[PDB]
Amino acid sequence: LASYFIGVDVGTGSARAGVFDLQGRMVGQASREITMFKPKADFVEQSSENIWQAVCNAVRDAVNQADINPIQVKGLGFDATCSLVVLDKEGNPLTVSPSGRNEQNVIVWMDHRAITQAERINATKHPVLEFVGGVISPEMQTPKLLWLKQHMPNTWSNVGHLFDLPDFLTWRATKDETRSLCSTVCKWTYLGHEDRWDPSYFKLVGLADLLDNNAAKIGATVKPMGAPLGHGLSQRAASEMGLIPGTAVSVSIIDAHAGTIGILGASGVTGENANFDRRIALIGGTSTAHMAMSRSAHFISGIWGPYYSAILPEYWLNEGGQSATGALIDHIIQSHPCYPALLEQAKNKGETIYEALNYILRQMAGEPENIAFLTNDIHMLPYFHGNRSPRANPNLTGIITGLKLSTTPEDMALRYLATIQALALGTRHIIETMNQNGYNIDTMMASGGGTKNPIFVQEHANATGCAMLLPEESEAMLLGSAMMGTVAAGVFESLPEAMAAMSRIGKTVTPQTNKIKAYYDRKYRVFHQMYHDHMRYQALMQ
Amino acid sequence: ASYFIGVDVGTGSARAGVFDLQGRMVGQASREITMFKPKADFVEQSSENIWQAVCNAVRDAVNQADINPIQVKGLGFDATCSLVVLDKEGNPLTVSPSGRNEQNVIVWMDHRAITQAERINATKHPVLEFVGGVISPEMQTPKLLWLKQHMPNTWSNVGHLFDLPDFLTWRATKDETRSLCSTVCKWTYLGHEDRWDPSYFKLVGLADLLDNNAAKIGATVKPMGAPLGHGLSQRAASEMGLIPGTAVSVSIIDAHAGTIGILGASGVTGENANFDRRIALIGGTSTAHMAMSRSAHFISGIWGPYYSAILPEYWLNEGGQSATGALIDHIIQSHPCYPALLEQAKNKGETIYEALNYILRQMAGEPENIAFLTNDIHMLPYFHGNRSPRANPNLTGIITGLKLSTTPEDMALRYLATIQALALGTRHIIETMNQNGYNIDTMMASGGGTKNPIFVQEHANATGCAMLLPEESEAMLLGSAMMGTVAAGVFESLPEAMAAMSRIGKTVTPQTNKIKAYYDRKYRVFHQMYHDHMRYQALMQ
Numbered sequence A: 001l002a003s004y005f006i007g008v009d010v011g012t013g014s015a016r017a018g019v020f021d022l023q024g025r026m027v028g029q030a031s032r033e034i035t036m037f038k039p040k041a042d043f044v045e046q047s048s049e050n051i052w053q054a055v056c057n058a059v060r061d062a063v064n065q066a067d068i069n070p071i072q073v074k075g076l077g078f079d080a081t082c083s084l085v086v087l088d089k090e091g092n093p094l095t096v097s098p099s100g101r102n103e104q105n106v107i108v109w110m111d112h113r114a115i116t117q118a119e120r121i122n123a124t125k126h127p128v129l130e131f132v133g134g135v136i137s138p139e140m141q142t143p144k145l146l147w148l149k150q151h152m153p154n155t156w157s158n159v160g161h162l163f164d165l166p167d168f169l170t171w172r173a174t175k176d177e178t179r180s181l182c183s184t185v186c187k188w189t190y191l192g193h194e195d196r197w198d199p200s201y202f203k204l205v206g207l208a209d210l211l212d213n214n215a216a217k218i219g220a221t222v223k224p225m226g227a228p229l230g231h232g233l234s235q236r237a238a239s240e241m242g243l244i245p246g247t248a249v250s251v252s253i254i255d256a257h258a259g260t261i262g263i264l265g266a267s268g269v270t271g272e273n274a275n276f277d278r279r280i281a282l283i284g285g286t287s288t289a290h291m292a293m294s295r296s297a298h299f300i301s302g303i304w305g306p307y308y309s310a311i312l313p314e315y316w317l318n319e320g321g322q323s324a325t326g327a328l329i330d331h332i333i334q335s336h337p338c339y340p341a342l343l344e345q346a347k348n349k350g351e352t353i354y355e356a357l358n359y360i361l362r363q364m365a366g367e368p369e370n371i372a373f374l375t376n377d378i379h380m381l382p383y384f385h386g387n388r389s390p391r392a393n394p395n396l397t398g399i400i401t402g403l404k405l406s407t408t409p410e411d412m413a414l415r416y417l418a419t420i421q422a423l424a425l426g427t428r429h430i431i432e433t434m435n436q437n438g439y440n441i442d443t444m445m446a447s448g449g450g451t452k453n454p455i456f457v458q459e460h461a462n463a464t465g466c467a468m469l470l471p472e473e474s475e476a477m478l479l480g481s482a483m484m485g486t487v488a489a490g491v492f493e494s495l496p497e498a499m500a501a502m503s504r505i506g507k508t509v510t511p512q513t514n515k516i517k518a519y520y521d522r523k524y525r526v527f528h529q530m531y532h533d534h535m536r537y538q539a540l541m542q
Numbered sequence B: 001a002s003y004f005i006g007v008d009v010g011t012g013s014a015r016a017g018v019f020d021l022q023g024r025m026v027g028q029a030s031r032e033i034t035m036f037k038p039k040a041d042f043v044e045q046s047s048e049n050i051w052q053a054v055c056n057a058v059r060d061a062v063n064q065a066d067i068n069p070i071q072v073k074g075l076g077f078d079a080t081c082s083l084v085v086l087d088k089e090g091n092p093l094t095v096s097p098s099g100r101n102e103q104n105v106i107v108w109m110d111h112r113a114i115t116q117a118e119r120i121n122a123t124k125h126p127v128l129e130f131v132g133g134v135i136s137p138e139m140q141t142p143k144l145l146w147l148k149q150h151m152p153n154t155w156s157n158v159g160h161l162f163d164l165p166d167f168l169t170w171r172a173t174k175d176e177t178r179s180l181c182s183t184v185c186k187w188t189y190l191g192h193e194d195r196w197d198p199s200y201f202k203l204v205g206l207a208d209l210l211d212n213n214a215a216k217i218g219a220t221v222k223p224m225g226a227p228l229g230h231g232l233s234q235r236a237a238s239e240m241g242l243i244p245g246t247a248v249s250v251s252i253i254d255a256h257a258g259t260i261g262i263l264g265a266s267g268v269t270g271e272n273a274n275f276d277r278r279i280a281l282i283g284g285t286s287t288a289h290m291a292m293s294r295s296a297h298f299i300s301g302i303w304g305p306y307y308s309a310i311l312p313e314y315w316l317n318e319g320g321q322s323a324t325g326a327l328i329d330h331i332i333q334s335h336p337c338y339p340a341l342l343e344q345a346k347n348k349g350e351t352i353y354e355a356l357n358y359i360l361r362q363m364a365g366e367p368e369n370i371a372f373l374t375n376d377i378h379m380l381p382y383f384h385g386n387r388s389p390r391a392n393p394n395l396t397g398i399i400t401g402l403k404l405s406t407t408p409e410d411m412a413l414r415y416l417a418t419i420q421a422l423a424l425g426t427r428h429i430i431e432t433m434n435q436n437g438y439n440i441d442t443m444m445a446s447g448g449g450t451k452n453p454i455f456v457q458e459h460a461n462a463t464g465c466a467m468l469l470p471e472e473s474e475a476m477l478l479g480s481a482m483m484g485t486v487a488a489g490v491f492e493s494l495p496e497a498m499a500a501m502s503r504i505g506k507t508v509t510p511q512t513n514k515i516k517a518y519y520d521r522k523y524r525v526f527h528q529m530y531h532d533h534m535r536y537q538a539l540m541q
């Protein structure tokens, strides 16, 4: 009579499933890779049928690993990348691809075929663009829809359903076509605060046809996370997954936002739900999303949103990011000529490259409180792939100072430390921007890459002057999705309730001394000056 | 603490297991592998697809174990006896009517080469005495004759011809060394003379395979547990998330890995396994029936005797049934009542086997009357031909006692008839071994069937032999891990790894004389069905 809940997370590379008990402890997990197709540059495609098979196999293996009965599984939640799934009028895969294969019916979030369409949309200056900083991205869905209407007219004539990936999953599981407020508000321009598609936008950009039949093709009904769909797991989906028909299924959510649910509510007050007002979520990895919520709407330069009820009801979401975080740290580490020799030594000692570099840093520092100061004369402007937040300029580039003609592991370690600090300083700039525009953030909840690196964590806390709180359960997106399942099943009455019950703080890392904090204040002055210097070089060259 | 990985690539999935030094599994994972069936009798796979599944399975299994890769000291690989074809650069080269190079593996169960096998058999070459007198189309030399005849463009561009398990070890280590198991069992290598027989390849139209010192098929051949290359290559280690140089054993065929994983368990009172009395029954999709002796026994319709194909200085007599798990699952899953029963099984927290076993129990009244439910329902189980001891790939299945009824009771009875038909086929093999040098009265059994109490008890009842079930039923994974311990130098020989890392967990014995006599009568019908089938064939000529 003990109950379990499953979260499913469909990432770029794999579909993953986790089985959780009622206190949020993971008792089972499994993974299946999903196939990627890259027919030409900027084109990145997947197959919805391949993904669904991956999800079903992952779920079956996780339940088996958990060693529980299917009647014990009482709720499912699904999250995925914000990719685009195209189906015909019968619900079957319909090609989006130069290959013509109907199997290739998913335009992956990271596909950039629709750059031209995004530029056309942006030129209209339509009001709904104000929620994406006035500049729609080619990754978002409406540019992609316009691209398909233009370049794949036969597909366009035969469309029955245009799903954000998370919504495809819940539809495939339940037959219910209802869409999530998350995908639709964040990525499709749905006005969460007016509960509607804006027909003026769709007409203006040349997508007027999507609104026919009560907007059947894109979402006639749109609901909050935690709401149960259809009559639960369909007979078909239950047989495919090895579960019980009717098992509750929540409305879907985008992957990063699931991560946020997974961690943002882990309470610092015994026997209360968490206070969100002063927290930011850092969803780390190769890139990082910076997510906070307010009771009021704030349009913040360089940050996306405000998106109403995109995660929690009666909260407006603001979302910033850094495009290369783990990716930048790995670029700096892996490009250094000492890398291969140090990697080999690390592997042989059963450590990660980060643990090996951290060891070097500790040795160079003498005592640990001196680690931050090792970069007193070495600075980095981290915008190697532009800056997303708060500068919103994809054309910015990186700078590194303090370079010497030395190629030792010590030099590599210093460059890695400078990278961590630059990224932490960029996080400080995002938090500061939010705090000048409606927030009072003083605490960071973190998940994903970097959270198992003690120097990464500590220097984020030092640079921002905010505590970094690390989760008991590392699997934030699977856990957040499972929490949605509990709400859909009625076990908890609200997401904040589920979050408080199913996540907790595993470790609190506070900023250190005033000396260390003041050092970062000076580093931050350099961080800002480097941007102005960059702009000055550009001016001089003109 | 030290750990060891077994990789087992079966018909449907690549699996990986992480074992401790006592042979307990501490992590596992699986990945499906793609099957292609261009037309009847043709069954193909992709080596690239297989390798990716293996790597992902290994990465996942280690992650589940939650150990550090530096802790993994040895790996062993086992696979089905499928044929992997690569070109001069080592890339997939098509074996398919589809002409797709991705389709470069002829799966063990493929029967495309029936006529080539017949032609080889008509030669009566001496090497045939070591496959029971009759080469199977499932074996590699018939398939190689088939490719040479049908696909000259492929044959022209061949660089490597690998039994799947040797493909795995080569991919992992860069060493092209072949295993004694794969070569002796499936390629006609003479384990007792340590060489290829040039007179066989000549006579059979494959002399060209022996060029450049047998480079295409294997110039160097070694026993299991020998370390290959200098352990994992940097690339394979990277691909699997392990440490370069980790020891990798010479490969082994899957059924043979299971034998290593179980046959050697000491008895419940301390005694050494006794190979005169104990056979390994290695279950799964298909089942192998493995007996070893210090002496050579030639047995018509049973593969072998194969010298040093599993243990050094032992001859292996290898029987088998080509469809066992596959047949049970075919009979269950093809029945119209399956989806409804599966749903009710899940509602009770049961497998489909437990749900059928319950129906049988209800229908019989008492548990001891279950066998008699098929008094008028009989099956000849040769759906994919018979491997042993008839050795005839042309044989087919028969089911009697059919009615219009489509109920869960009908489904359960047909499932029981299947189990019993497989048990009677096992009896036929065991009786044949006992006419040829053995005194088998016990089966050491592995595989999914062994978690089904009706499958286990009716095998014991039909054969008169005790069923011994191991503590770890994943015998193939465990045997491969054991080989990893030997390549790592942790145990000196396979027999000491076997006794340290496997143990008995259950002993199930035959039941009453009334039940035994019933199976004696069913066995008369089982034999009669074969003669009946041949008589239909005669009448149709």
Ligand SMILES: O=C(CO)[C@H](O)[C@H](O)CO
Binding pocket: B011, B079, B080, B081, B082, B108, B185, B253, B254, B255, B256, B285, B286, B288, B318, B320
């Ligand atoms: O590899 C296969 C398929 O599992 C068979 O087990 C061999 O034919 C046994 O020799």
